[PDB]
Amino acid sequence: NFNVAHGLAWSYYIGYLRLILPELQARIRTYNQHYNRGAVSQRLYILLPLDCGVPDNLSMADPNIRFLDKLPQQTGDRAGIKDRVYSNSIYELLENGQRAGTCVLEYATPLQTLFAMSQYSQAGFSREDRLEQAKLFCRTLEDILADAPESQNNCRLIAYQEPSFSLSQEVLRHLRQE
Amino acid sequence: NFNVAHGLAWSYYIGYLRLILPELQARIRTYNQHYNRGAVSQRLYILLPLDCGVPDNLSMADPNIRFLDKLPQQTGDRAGIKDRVYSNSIYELLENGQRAGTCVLEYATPLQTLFAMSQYSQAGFSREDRLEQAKLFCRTLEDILADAPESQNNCRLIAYQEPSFSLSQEVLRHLRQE
Ligand SMILES: Nc1nc2c(ncn2[C@@H]2O[C@@H]3COP(=O)(O)O[C@@H]4[C@H](O)[C@@H](COP(=O)(O)O[C@H]3[C@H]2O)O[C@H]4n2cnc3c(N)ncnc32)c(=O)[nH]1
């Protein structure tokens, strides 16, 4: 099942990142000018927990990550679905009670597929293989984005293992660099 | 890359079908009672062209398939995205100028990933392998749905090869049976 994470990464690129990354800066600029608090950063920040533990509510993983607003939606006809909607959420990052950064932030959803596959007996995906597939997912995606025309300093991958751990501090480190 | 279609099918189930199938009949019943034309059929009809040719506009594949309306959207928090939106389109099927059926209808989007992967040199997916992966995708999905609790006569797969061909007649055949 090595080809499992491989295909999921290509799917994530083909069916999502390549479609939304080109329009992202315009959506952010629209938000910055129309519905606004400091400036939203210019990159999509993608969280890649190698334990494939992907909560649906980000504030649950860390209270210092607080939902601010939704980006204006992106829509288009997709595979027979009229006006399919692509949604992204903006988060504020707090640090000792100060707003320290603002960004479009989400988990890489395919890591949730890896996790659920490892739970379903019919998937033939060993629970022991979650970390290995997660790593391959990250490496594949990294190699894809390194060479993708739509990636132009508008995407940032954040991969990490928890062994304390501060997810907000991990994100702020990448924001600081930018 | 056999594991390619395998993973895509499990992804399609885990990240989509298992989430939307349980609520689908209530969304259809809501539409039937609130925004209505004959009754919308009770199953989600999924188109699986084995040539992986997936137009984004269904009326383009066959003019006898005409967009009627959107189902009421489904939303939930998903992997850090607040109120992620799941959308489905309702279509009327015409037959010699008569409205002959009405259903929720779409292409299986992962077939688009197979297709695009076969085009990208970095994916290492042979163009010659599209039909084989498409078949495996269909077989895997079929085996998944055969045993899935959320599938309860509310999903129908329509797989086909074009060698004339009438996509509308192919769909109407399955609707007739139901
Ligand atoms: N009609 C309809 N179908 C939907 C919708 N959302 C998902 N589907 C179907 O489920 C497959 C898996 O979805 P996922 O959210 O678990 O992750 C996908 C996948 O890893 C990768 C490629 O997507 P696609 O090829 O369209 O496969 C999707 C589809 O067949 O990108 C991820 N992804 C796709 N859309 C989003 C999004 N809006 N936000 C975050 N991640 C996404 C739906 O709304 N309607």
Curated annotation (Swiss-Prot), chains A, B:
Provide the protein name: Stimulator of interferon genes protein
**Which location does the Swiss-Prot or TrEMBL entry give for the cross-link Glycyl lysine isopeptide (Lys-Gly) (interchain with G-Cter in ubiquitin)?**
K82
Question: Which disease annotation does the entry carry?
Answer: STING-associated vasculopathy, infantile-onset: An autoinflammatory disease characterized by early-onset systemic inflammation and cutaneous vasculopathy, resulting in severe skin lesions. Violaceous, scaling lesions of fingers, toes, nose, cheeks and ears progress to acral necrosis in most of the patients. Some patients have severe interstitial lung disease.
Q: Which organism is it from?
A: Homo sapiens
Coiled-coil segments on the chain, per record: none
Q: What is the lineage of its organism?
A: Eukaryota, Metazoa, Chordata, Craniata, Vertebrata
| Family of the protein in this entry | Belongs to the STING family.
The PTM entry states:
Phosphorylation by TBK1 leads to activation and production of IFN-beta. The phosphorylated pLxIS motif constitutes an IRF3-binding motif, leading to recruitment of the transcription factor IRF3 to induce type-I interferons and other cytokines. The phosphorylated pLxIS motif facilitates SENP2 recruitment during late phase of viral infection. Phosphorylated on tyrosine residues upon MHC-II aggregation.
Q: What quaternary structure, including any partners, is listed in this protein's UniProt entry?
A: Homotetramer; in presence of cyclic nucleotide (c-di-GMP or cGAMP), forms tetramers and higher-order oligomers through side-by-side packing. Interacts (when phosphorylated) with IRF3; following activation and phosphorylation on the pLxIS motif by TBK1, recruits IRF3. Interacts with RIGI, MAVS and SSR2. Interacts with RNF5 and TRIM56. Interacts with TBK1; when homodimer, leading to subsequent production of IFN-beta. (Microbial infection) Interacts with human papillomavirus (HPV) protein E7.
Effect of changing P110A: reported as:
Strong decrease in c-di-GMP-binding
- Which residues are on the Cytoplasmic side of the membrane? 1-178
